[PDB]
Amino acid sequence: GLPYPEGYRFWTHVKSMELKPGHPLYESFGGLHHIYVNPTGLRTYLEGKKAPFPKGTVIVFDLLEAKVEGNALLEGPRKLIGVMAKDPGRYPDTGGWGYYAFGPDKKPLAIDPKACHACHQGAANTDYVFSAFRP
Amino acid sequence: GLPYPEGYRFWTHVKSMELKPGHPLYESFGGLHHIYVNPTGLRTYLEGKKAPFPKGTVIVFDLLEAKVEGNALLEGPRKLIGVMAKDPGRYPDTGGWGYYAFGPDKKPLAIDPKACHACHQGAANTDYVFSAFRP
Ligand code: HEC
Ligand code: HEC
C-alpha cells in the first residue's frame, strides 16, 4: 500500500506520448499520457539514467483519454495513473520498484505488480524506466 | 527584450494540445504544444483565472513537432516557445503582458507582440490567457 502521490501534478514533466488504436499497449494504456517525476528522481533523468534512481524516487504515468475534435488532439478525462516508487530494501523482487496504480477518484486499483515489472524488465539497463527526459 | 525563461521546463505543466493540419492555427502553431506556468502564476490558474495574473507571472507555450509513428503520437523536435510575462506597468498597451518568442536555439524570434495580443484579446475575460489548468 502506497499513499496516493499527492501533488504529482506539479512535479517535473518528463515526456508525453499518445498510444493510438492498434498499438500493442492500447488496450491497457491507450490514450494520451504524461510522465512526471518528483524532485528526488529528476537528476537521474537529466543525466540519462546511467545510474540507478535513488530511494525516494517517484514517477507517475498520467493517462488521459485522447479526444480528437476539429483538427486537434484534446486532453480528455483521466483514465488512471501508474506509479513507480523506488525503495531497494522494500521491493527486492521487483528491482527495488514499487508498482502502484490509482483511478481518477484517487482510489487504488487492483494490479499485479509482478506483471508491471515483467514488462519493465525490458528497460533493466536504465533501472527499469523506459521514458527519457525530453529537453 | 526579455531574457530566455531559463528553467521553464521544470515549471508546472498546465495542459497539452495537438493542432493538426487544417486547424486555423496550424500554420503558426501546428504540432504538439505544452503550456507551463512559473510559481508566481500558478495559483491564478488553480483558482480558475477569475482574478488577473500577478506581476511576475510567466507562461510558456512550448511547441513541438508532432510525429506519428507506429500507432503513436511522439514528441518531435522543438519548433519554438511563446512566452507571456505579466508586468502591468511595463506593458500598458498589451494588457500588462509582454509577448515574446524564442527558437530551439534559445535565440529571440522577431515577432509582432501587438499581433499576439490582438488574438489574445479574445481571452480578455480571463486576463488574456486562453488555457485552463487541467487537473
Ligand atoms: C509492457 C507490456 C508494460 C506493462 C505491463 C507496464 N508498463 Fe509501465 N511503461 C511501459 C512503457 C513502454 C513505458 C514508457 C512510456 C513512454 O512514454 O515512454 C512505461 C512507463 C511507465 C511509467 C513511467 C516510467 C517509465 O518506465 O518510463 C510508469 C510509472 C509506469 N509505466 C507504471 C506501470 C505500472 C504501475 C504498471 C502495472 C499496472 C505498468 N507500468 C505496466 C510499458 C509497460
Ligand atoms: C490567435 C490567432 C493567436 C495568436 C495570434 C497568438 N496566440 Fe497565443 N494562444 C492562442 C490560443 C488559442 C492559446 C491556447 C492554447 C491551448 O492549449 O489552450 C494560446 C496560448 C498561448 C500561451 C499560453 C497561455 C494562454 O493564453 O493560454 C502563450 C504563452 C502564448 N499563446 C504566446 C503567444 C505569442 C508569444 C504570440 C505571438 C508570437 C501568440 N501567442 C499569438 C492563440 C493565439
XYZ file of C-alpha atoms and ligand atoms in Angstrom:
356
model
C 0.000 0.000 0.000
C 1.424 3.321 -1.159
C -0.386 6.586 -0.378
C -1.675 8.446 -3.397
C 1.216 10.578 -4.749
C -0.430 13.857 -3.744
C 0.920 16.790 -5.701
C 2.487 14.789 -8.541
C 0.592 17.129 -10.934
C 3.092 19.855 -10.006
C 6.178 17.688 -10.486
C 8.538 17.896 -13.445
C 7.038 16.911 -16.811
C 9.321 14.240 -18.347
C 7.622 13.477 -21.682
C 4.253 12.848 -23.309
C 3.023 10.291 -25.771
C -0.275 9.193 -27.345
C -0.937 5.487 -27.858
C -3.435 5.051 -30.677
C -5.693 2.102 -31.593
C -3.649 -0.828 -32.848
C -0.735 -0.117 -30.534
C 0.176 -3.257 -28.540
C -0.355 -1.206 -25.356
C -3.609 0.420 -26.499
C -5.902 -1.883 -24.517
C -4.043 -1.269 -21.249
C -2.682 2.283 -21.664
C -4.421 3.705 -24.740
C -4.791 7.480 -24.793
C -2.564 10.472 -24.135
C -0.181 10.043 -21.226
C 2.198 12.399 -19.441
C 5.065 11.222 -17.243
C 6.088 13.180 -14.141
C 8.979 12.723 -11.720
C 9.387 14.085 -8.200
C 12.479 16.134 -7.257
C 14.268 13.092 -5.844
C 14.236 11.308 -9.186
C 14.713 14.208 -11.597
C 18.512 14.390 -11.656
C 18.809 10.722 -12.669
C 16.633 11.504 -15.691
C 18.659 14.611 -16.549
C 21.896 12.596 -16.514
C 20.470 9.996 -18.901
C 19.566 7.177 -16.472
C 23.142 5.920 -16.409
C 22.928 5.363 -12.648
C 20.024 3.865 -10.689
C 17.239 6.089 -9.470
C 17.668 6.871 -5.757
C 15.423 5.649 -2.989
C 12.561 8.111 -2.680
C 12.137 8.480 -6.452
C 8.505 8.545 -7.522
C 7.432 8.517 -11.171
C 3.832 8.906 -12.306
C 2.348 7.750 -15.601
C -0.719 10.003 -16.036
C -3.115 8.501 -18.594
C -5.819 10.646 -20.202
C -8.422 9.977 -22.845
C -7.344 11.326 -26.221
C -10.130 13.383 -27.801
C -9.940 14.278 -31.498
C -12.094 17.323 -32.312
C -11.800 19.930 -35.055
C -8.227 19.243 -36.226
C -6.935 18.994 -32.668
C -5.988 16.358 -30.122
C -7.518 17.422 -26.794
C -6.960 16.083 -23.306
C -9.968 14.033 -22.276
C -10.914 12.679 -18.855
C -8.280 10.979 -16.738
C -8.257 7.190 -17.075
C -5.704 6.195 -14.418
C -2.249 6.875 -13.059
C 0.579 4.387 -12.815
C 3.203 4.965 -10.135
C 6.725 3.639 -9.631
C 8.325 4.323 -6.246
C 11.987 3.476 -5.648
C 12.837 1.659 -2.403
C 15.514 -1.039 -2.884
C 15.009 -2.612 0.542
C 11.216 -2.531 0.371
C 10.789 -4.095 -3.110
C 13.648 -6.595 -3.604
C 11.733 -8.855 -6.015
C 10.733 -6.068 -8.411
C 14.134 -4.412 -8.859
C 13.626 -2.055 -5.939
C 10.490 -0.569 -7.521
C 7.032 -0.433 -6.014
C 4.423 -0.529 -8.772
C 1.043 1.027 -7.962
C -1.988 2.334 -9.815
C -4.823 4.719 -8.908
C -8.099 5.600 -10.605
C -9.439 9.071 -11.362
C -11.087 9.064 -7.922
C -7.589 8.589 -6.387
C -8.569 5.118 -5.128
C -6.092 2.240 -5.550
C -6.623 -0.075 -8.496
C -6.070 -3.812 -8.163
C -2.947 -4.592 -10.186
C -0.378 -7.341 -10.462
C 2.920 -5.556 -9.711
C 4.867 -8.614 -10.904
C 3.201 -8.132 -14.309
C 4.134 -4.439 -14.372
C 7.740 -5.307 -13.583
C 7.825 -8.169 -16.110
C 7.409 -5.708 -18.971
C 9.612 -3.068 -17.323
C 12.400 -5.642 -17.139
C 12.821 -4.765 -20.819
C 14.280 -1.486 -19.505
C 16.515 -3.113 -16.866
C 19.511 -1.327 -18.423
C 18.065 2.015 -17.353
C 16.856 0.905 -13.904
C 13.534 -0.401 -15.265
C 12.414 3.014 -16.547
C 11.564 3.345 -20.247
C 10.897 7.063 -20.636
C 13.709 9.520 -21.285
C 13.553 13.153 -20.211
C 12.793 15.221 -23.291
C 14.605 18.514 -23.229
C 13.840 42.308 -24.609
C 13.057 39.549 -22.126
C 15.749 37.055 -21.083
C 15.084 33.484 -22.104
C 12.842 31.921 -19.409
C 15.582 29.600 -18.153
C 14.189 26.630 -16.284
C 10.617 26.875 -17.590
C 10.926 23.145 -18.478
C 10.678 22.393 -14.748
C 7.657 24.616 -14.135
C 4.113 23.371 -13.624
C 2.528 21.653 -16.639
C -0.825 23.387 -17.316
C -2.191 21.465 -20.320
C -1.232 19.983 -23.679
C -2.835 20.059 -27.076
C -2.023 18.979 -30.644
C -3.006 21.245 -33.531
C -3.390 19.157 -36.673
C -3.360 20.154 -40.365
C -6.436 22.180 -41.245
C -6.596 23.882 -37.864
C -6.751 27.684 -38.294
C -3.623 27.908 -36.105
C -1.756 25.066 -37.833
C 0.467 27.308 -39.959
C 1.637 29.348 -36.962
C 1.472 26.843 -34.073
C 0.943 23.434 -35.689
C 2.249 20.478 -33.701
C 2.075 19.286 -30.110
C 2.347 22.040 -27.529
C 2.659 22.042 -23.747
C 1.904 25.068 -21.578
C 3.910 25.763 -18.416
C 3.499 28.392 -15.707
C 6.030 29.605 -13.149
C 5.200 29.536 -9.413
C 4.088 33.171 -9.426
C 1.305 32.490 -11.905
C 0.177 29.019 -10.842
C -2.353 29.949 -8.158
C -4.308 32.165 -10.573
C -4.693 29.140 -12.848
C -5.736 26.895 -9.956
C -8.461 29.357 -8.935
C -9.894 29.453 -12.460
C -8.444 32.750 -13.760
C -11.158 34.763 -12.040
C -8.603 37.370 -10.958
C -5.753 38.820 -13.030
C -2.411 37.084 -13.096
C 0.070 38.851 -10.792
C 3.112 40.772 -11.911
C 5.952 38.290 -12.265
C 3.761 35.631 -13.901
C 5.478 33.889 -16.791
C 3.691 31.412 -19.058
C 5.436 29.397 -21.760
C 3.840 27.855 -24.837
C 6.247 25.025 -25.766
C 5.665 23.918 -29.368
C 6.996 20.570 -30.600
C 6.735 18.730 -33.880
C 4.094 16.012 -33.736
C 5.473 12.724 -35.065
C 3.076 9.895 -35.935
C 4.842 6.511 -35.921
C 3.524 3.007 -35.298
C 0.133 3.852 -33.750
C 1.631 6.546 -31.538
C 1.976 10.313 -31.412
C 5.585 11.070 -30.439
C 7.210 14.322 -29.411
C 9.334 15.597 -32.271
C 11.916 18.384 -32.309
C 11.109 21.684 -30.646
C 9.765 24.316 -33.041
C 9.586 27.391 -30.787
C 8.402 28.700 -27.451
C 5.955 31.522 -26.906
C 6.201 33.457 -23.650
C 3.804 35.770 -21.826
C 5.249 37.751 -18.915
C 2.962 39.804 -16.668
C 4.088 43.351 -15.828
C 1.185 45.851 -15.813
C 3.411 48.932 -15.679
C 5.856 47.670 -18.297
C 3.306 46.627 -20.973
C 0.330 49.024 -20.719
C -0.693 48.711 -24.385
C -0.856 44.905 -24.395
C -2.958 44.387 -21.261
C 0.063 44.231 -18.983
C 1.509 41.265 -20.895
C 4.895 41.065 -22.554
C 4.725 38.727 -25.543
C 7.992 37.072 -26.587
C 9.131 34.108 -28.646
C 12.340 32.050 -28.781
C 13.626 29.427 -31.199
C 15.010 25.994 -30.349
C 18.465 27.584 -30.054
C 17.037 29.872 -27.307
C 17.549 32.933 -29.535
C 14.768 35.545 -29.740
C 12.437 35.353 -32.715
C 11.211 38.501 -34.438
C 7.512 38.776 -33.608
C 4.807 41.406 -33.613
C 3.631 41.480 -29.974
C 0.626 43.611 -30.970
C -0.450 40.728 -33.235
C -0.047 38.204 -30.410
C -2.172 40.370 -28.134
C -4.787 41.016 -30.842
C -5.754 37.344 -30.839
C -5.335 37.000 -27.065
C -7.820 39.840 -26.624
C -10.366 37.102 -27.338
C -9.492 35.865 -23.828
C -9.654 39.308 -22.178
C -12.206 37.910 -19.705
C -9.538 35.639 -18.246
C -6.691 38.184 -18.306
C -5.778 37.381 -21.927
C -4.916 33.739 -21.180
C -6.783 31.028 -23.100
C -5.526 27.828 -21.489
C -7.139 26.420 -18.362
C -5.248 24.307 -15.845
C -6.247 20.698 -16.405
C -6.463 18.803 -13.166
C 4.615 -3.501 -21.195
C 3.620 -4.595 -21.628
C 4.218 -2.689 -19.911
C 3.499 -3.056 -18.821
C 2.967 -4.446 -18.389
C 3.551 -1.965 -17.867
N 4.172 -0.892 -18.453
Fe 4.696 0.815 -17.473
N 5.531 1.554 -19.236
C 5.636 0.822 -20.419
C 6.255 1.651 -21.431
C 6.595 1.286 -22.891
C 6.517 2.997 -20.765
C 7.170 4.227 -21.421
C 6.102 5.226 -21.851
C 6.733 6.398 -22.563
O 6.035 7.440 -22.719
O 7.916 6.302 -22.983
C 6.031 2.840 -19.419
C 6.102 3.805 -18.457
C 5.659 3.694 -17.168
C 5.942 4.652 -16.132
C 6.826 5.904 -16.343
C 8.290 5.493 -16.106
C 8.900 4.712 -17.256
O 9.194 3.492 -17.110
O 9.131 5.311 -18.331
C 5.333 4.248 -15.009
C 5.369 4.977 -13.638
C 4.642 3.010 -15.310
N 4.860 2.700 -16.646
C 3.877 2.252 -14.451
C 3.386 0.995 -14.723
C 2.508 0.238 -13.854
C 2.048 0.723 -12.456
C 2.250 -0.941 -14.449
C 1.393 -2.116 -13.911
C -0.037 -1.705 -13.516
C 2.952 -0.953 -15.719
N 3.629 0.236 -15.871
C 2.961 -1.984 -16.631
C 5.250 -0.485 -20.605
C 4.593 -1.292 -19.704
C -4.766 33.554 -32.352
C -4.714 33.823 -33.869
C -3.386 33.603 -31.604
C -2.266 34.322 -31.863
C -2.017 35.464 -32.880
C -1.332 34.095 -30.777
N -1.837 33.122 -29.953
Fe -1.022 32.588 -28.163
N -2.574 31.222 -27.882
C -3.666 31.089 -28.740
C -4.531 30.044 -28.240
C -5.864 29.540 -28.832
C -3.861 29.515 -26.978
C -4.391 28.393 -26.065
C -3.681 27.080 -26.376
C -4.251 25.962 -25.538
O -3.589 24.889 -25.456
O -5.357 26.124 -24.960
C -2.661 30.298 -26.845
C -1.770 30.175 -25.818
C -0.624 30.902 -25.653
C 0.174 30.890 -24.454
C -0.200 30.086 -23.187
C -1.136 30.958 -22.333
C -2.558 31.029 -22.862
O -3.008 32.112 -23.331
O -3.274 30.004 -22.791
C 1.232 31.688 -24.646
C 2.357 31.977 -23.616
C 1.130 32.231 -25.987
N -0.020 31.725 -26.579
C 2.010 33.090 -26.608
C 1.788 33.723 -27.811
C 2.751 34.554 -28.503
C 4.156 34.897 -27.948
C 2.174 35.002 -29.634
C 2.776 35.953 -30.702
C 4.122 35.468 -31.270
C 0.832 34.453 -29.688
N 0.620 33.672 -28.576
C -0.097 34.679 -30.679
C -3.913 31.842 -29.865
C -3.091 32.794 -30.424
